[PDB]
Amino acid sequence: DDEFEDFPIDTWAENWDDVEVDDDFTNELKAEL
Amino acid sequence: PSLAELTKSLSIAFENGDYAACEKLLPPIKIELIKNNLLIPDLSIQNDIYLNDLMITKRILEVGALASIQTFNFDSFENYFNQLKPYYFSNNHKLSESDKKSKLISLYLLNLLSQNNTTKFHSELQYLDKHIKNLEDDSLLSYPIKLDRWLMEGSYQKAWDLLQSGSQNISEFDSFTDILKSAIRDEIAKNTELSYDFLPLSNIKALLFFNNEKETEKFALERNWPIVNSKVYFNNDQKTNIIEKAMDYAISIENIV
Amino acid sequence: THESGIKPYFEQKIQETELKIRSKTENVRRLEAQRNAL
Amino acid sequence: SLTTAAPLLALLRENQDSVKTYALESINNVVDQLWSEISNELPDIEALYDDDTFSDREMAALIASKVYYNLGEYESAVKYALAAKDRFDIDEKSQFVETIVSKSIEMYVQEASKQYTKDEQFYTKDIIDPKLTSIFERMIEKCLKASELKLALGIAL
Amino acid sequence: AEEDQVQELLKVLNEISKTTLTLDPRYIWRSLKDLSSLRNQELLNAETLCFTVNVLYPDSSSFKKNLLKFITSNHKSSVPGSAELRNSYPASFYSVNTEKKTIEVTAEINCFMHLLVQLFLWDSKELEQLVEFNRKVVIPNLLCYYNLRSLNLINAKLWFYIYLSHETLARSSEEINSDNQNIILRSTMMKFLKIASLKHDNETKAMLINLILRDFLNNGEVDSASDFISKLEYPHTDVSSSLEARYFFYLSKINAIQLDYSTANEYIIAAIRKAPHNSKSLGFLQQSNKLHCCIQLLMGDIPELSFFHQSNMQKSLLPYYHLTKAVKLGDLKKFTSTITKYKQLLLKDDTYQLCVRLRSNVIKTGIRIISLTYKKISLRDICLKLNLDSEQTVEYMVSRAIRDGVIEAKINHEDGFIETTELLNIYDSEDPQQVFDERIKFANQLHDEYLVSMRYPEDKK
Amino acid sequence: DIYFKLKKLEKEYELLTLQEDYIKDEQRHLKRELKRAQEEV
Incomplete structure (x- = not known):
């Protein structure tokens, strides 16, 4: 059991990727023509 | 003679551009430098009398290093920088100031890049980062760092520009222009030997950053590329497999048994 | 450390032989266990 | 003091005997802290010792022996330290002296065993390297002065 | 009392x-x-x-x-x-x-x-x-x-x-x-x-x-x-084991700064495995995990974006998480923004020197993305999708990349198209031999130490 | 004094080396005779 006092604790003053969203692409401009 | 007149002569010869005269003057100085015990900045003694000659030794070594670099004496420049190392990289505020510090360190880093010793370059870059605040802000120190980063990326177009734009900015890097440009050119040649097939020589002349076709053809002949109609065609231990591995697996299985 | 002459000789060699004794005694005890079981 | 051995190392290539002597003297007192960088160019110090025209080859041999001893090759350190002759101290309080003496007597015992294997009658008055035999004899005489009769007899056996 | x-x-x-x-x-x-x-x-x-x-x-x-x-x-x-x-x-x-x-x-x-x-x-x-x-x-x-x-x-x-x-x-x-x-x-x-x-x-x-x-x-x-x-x-x-973990972490640092990334990765994984996971050891584990992430990114392998959602170590990996996202997308602008924003935090961990070296890897992974999804791609489109400059810079970067292992492709100057070839089937060469040899070595040594540890209770029996 | 301790430790080590080689050889021949006895029974 070592306290690891040389390395201080930093101070502060089912999932993989899919971090972006496609939103409403729709793209009805093709349907315009 | 004595130290002071030797320093005066060294300074005058440097201001006159007589680098050979400076290189002649240096060996006499070092004997009395040793006699006065000034070469090693002894940290045990903090007497100001000892300190006042430390910047004199700094000046002497800086002139020695510049005389070496202007006389194509990279080895002697390395030796003088090593002798200067304790003076610069120390907490001694009176000792660790020099208007020529950035120039000397940048010259050392460019020399390290010229010897294509990238490991040494990165290690010393970490050293200088830890020992100097705001490393990237200094343009003179930024020069070798930028030349390394843009070379690692591959944007030699921004690197060959920097080498040609170095010009008078520091006025000492002109001694290193040839070797760095040669390294850039041979690196680009290595890159092109594997990527392009049937590359016209006219585009090669500008791709390799050359100036006239004759040097391009000579360089291609040095690399042994055929020049058929100016259309360069590049063309171009561990263990016995199966046996060794299977036998070793059998040995490991049966030895422990 | 300090001292020199004959005494450091025998002290160091005794230390080396003691380490050899410890490791080899452990190995011998393991081997004896397997031998006795078999 | 110094944090890197390169400052004093740059002197080791130069020509003037005075700067070589000063560099060898300075490195000897600080080789403890920086054995790695000094060990990087060990051929240079070895060649300095090899040259006969040098006026301080003994200190070069001693410093090379210290570097080798710090490395781990104790036999080469024993070989070089004996070649340092008078420069290699025998009575100073240091781990280097104790370890070099112990390894020297290691080698002396092995070589004398070989000698008595082939030349059984005697170790012979001069076959062994004179420096090693002299060191062994001086060490056992010193232990005799300290009234270590039993250990002296044992090591002689 | x-x-x-x-x-x-x-x-x-x-x-x-x-x-x-x-x-x-x-x-x-x-x-x-x-x-x-x-x-x-x-x-x-x-x-x-x-x-x-x-x-x-x-x-x-x-x-x-x-x-x-x-x-x-x-x-x-x-x-x-x-x-x-x-x-x-x-x-x-x-x-x-x-x-x-x-x-x-x-x-x-x-x-x-x-x-x-x-x-x-x-x-x-x-x-x-x-x-x-x-x-x-x-x-x-x-x-x-x-x-x-x-x-x-x-x-x-x-x-x-x-x-x-x-x-x-x-x-x-x-x-x-x-x-x-x-x-x-x-x-x-x-x-x-x-x-x-x-x-x-x-x-x-x-x-x-x-x-x-x-x-x-x-x-x-x-x-x-x-x-x-x-x-x-x-x-x-x-x-x-604590001393071993300390030594292996420092050795990983030393071999990492000197561009020996494989050895650094191996030593950092050994240090991570050799350290106690008690709450009192959290700081050392965090400082080692930051460096493990940096080494993985610099070696080319993109770390799995779920270990960033780990235990109390998670609150400090956020700058490295954003850096990993920027590298995965291979966008130089986002990488520069993240580097400039978290410069102080990156240097306070004494990893800013390592992290700036990631700039080359961003270009490498961007070229990998635009070369795996384009059999024949115009150079102008490569420049646009890489957010870069005139054809010459793209040509230099591609020529650097293909001879640097990644991008088994080919450049032709006729009309600005990088006709990359297919990928050689890995299950036709000696690479599986090496992978399985490493796995067999590890399993066999594991079983050997297992038996040597088991043997003592035989006497204790 | 010290020399006697060194020699005694050397003798103990050498005897122990004898013991180790004995035990290894006996392990091998116990394997052999175990197979033989299993067959004989």
Whole structure:
């Protein structure tokens, strides 16, 4: 059991990727023509 | 003679551009430098009398290093920088100031890049980062760092520009222009030997950053590329497999048994 | 450390032989266990 | 003091005997802290010792022996330290002296065993390297002065 | 309340006292475990160490004078008490010095008292006189004096506290003589390291190697450290797993800054596996995981974006998470924005030097993305999708990339198209041979150590 | 004194080496005779 006092604790003053969203692409401009 | 007149002569010869005269003057100085015990900045003694000659030794070594670099004496420049190392990289505020510090360190880093010793370059870059605040802000120190980063990326177009734009900015890097440009050119040649097939020589002349076709053809002949109609065609231990591995697996299985 | 002459000789060699004794005694005890079981 | 051995190392290539002597003297007192960088160019110090025209080859041999001893090759350190002759101290309080003496007597015992294997009658008055035999004899005489009769007899056996 | 603390301390010292008769490495490991336990609740407190020293150290012991000077220079409630209790305590607590025919404090006992003094000063934030003690007592009088192989582990923790206190004082304050002090400390530590290696102990050499490496890294000197470890062997015997983890982490640092990323990754994974996962070890684990992430990114492999959602380590990996996202998307603008934003946090972890080197890898992975999804792609479109400049820069980058392993492609200057070829089937070459050989090696050595550990209860059966 | 301790430790080591080689050889021949006895029974 070592306290690891040389390395201080930093101070502060089912999932993989899919971090972006496609939103409403729709793209009805093709349907315009 | 004595130290002071030797320093005066060294300074005058440097201001006159007589680098050979400076290189002649240096060996006499070092004997009395040793006699006065000034070469090693002894940290045990903090007497100001000892300190006042430390910047004199700094000046002497800086002139020695510049005389070496202007006389194509990279080895002697390395030796003088090593002798200067304790003076610069120390907490001694009176000792660790020099208007020529950035120039000397940048010259050392460019020399390290010229010897294509990238490991040494990165290690010393970490050293200088830890020992100097705001490393990237200094343009003179930024020069070798930028030349390394843009070379690692591959944007030699921004690197060959920097080498040609170095010009008078520091006025000492002109001694290193040839070797760095040669390294850039041979690196680009290595890159092109594997990527392009049937590359016209006219585009090669500008791709390799050359100036006239004759040097391009000579360089291609040095690399042994055929020049058929100016259309360069590049063309171009561990263990016995199966046996060794299977036998070793059998040995490991049966030895422990 | 300090001292020199004959005494450091025998002290160091005794230390080396003691380490050899410890490791080899452990190995011998393991081997004896397997031998006795078999 | 110094944090890197390169400052004093740059002197080791130069020509003037005075700067070589000063560099060898300075490195000897600080080789403890920086054995790695000094060990990087060990051929240079070895060649300095090899040259006969040098006026301080003994200190070069001693410093090379210290570097080798710090490395781990104790036999080469024993070989070089004996070649340092008078420069290699025998009575100073240091781990280097104790370890070099112990390894020297290691080698002396092995070589004398070989000698008595082939030349059984005697170790012979001069076959062994004179420096090693002299060191062994001086060490056992010193232990005799300290009234270590039993250990002296044992090591002689 | 002082009485119970004194009795507990005396029980601990008796536990360490048995080694003088046992002459064995045991009875000190349990002592250090109980010592950490005592420091956990501060049961050593204060004014009880003074009582213990007064009733234990005889006046003939020169160490007692300096120890009393340093623990408290004002408390003078010198209790007579057990002043006659000399033969009452077991003889393990003393030793009749034949030189002067006087009893004296046992060597291990004295070292334990000095260690306790170090611990009390460290846990009272009294750093100045802590470093004064470091430079005045333990170094010049204790460590240089006891040439015994039974001390061992005591010297390791003592050295650890010496270096830790010195570094904390040096970094915290700002003086001008710290250079010579640091040089002297490094020289002393390395001399003691050589002495310990020659005396053939194991824990002290390992701890001194760790301390020297930490000093080299904190100073910034790297190449000297790289040559230093290359000419030494870190023993794997009697060494606790914590020391191994420390050494492997520092070795990973050293091999990482010098562009040896494979070795750095292997050593950092070994360090991660060799470290305790208790809550008290969280800081070291976090500092190692940051570097593991940096090494994985720099080697080319993109870390799986779920270990960023780990335990309490998760709150500090956010800058590295954004960097990983920027690399995965291969966008130089986002990478530059993240680097500029978290520059201070990246340098405070001493990884900013490593992280700036990621700029090349961003270009490499961008070219990999635009070469895996484009059999034949116009150079202008490559430039646009790479957010870059005129055709020449793209050509230079591509020519660099294809000869640098990645992008098994081919460039033709006719009309700006990089006609990349297909990928050779990996299950047609000798690479699976190598992968399976590595796996078999690991499994076989694992089974071998498994059997060698299993074998002992056969005798214990 | 010290020399006697060194020689005694050397003798103990050498005897122990004898013991180790004995035990290894006996392990191998116990394997052999175990197979033989299993067959004989």
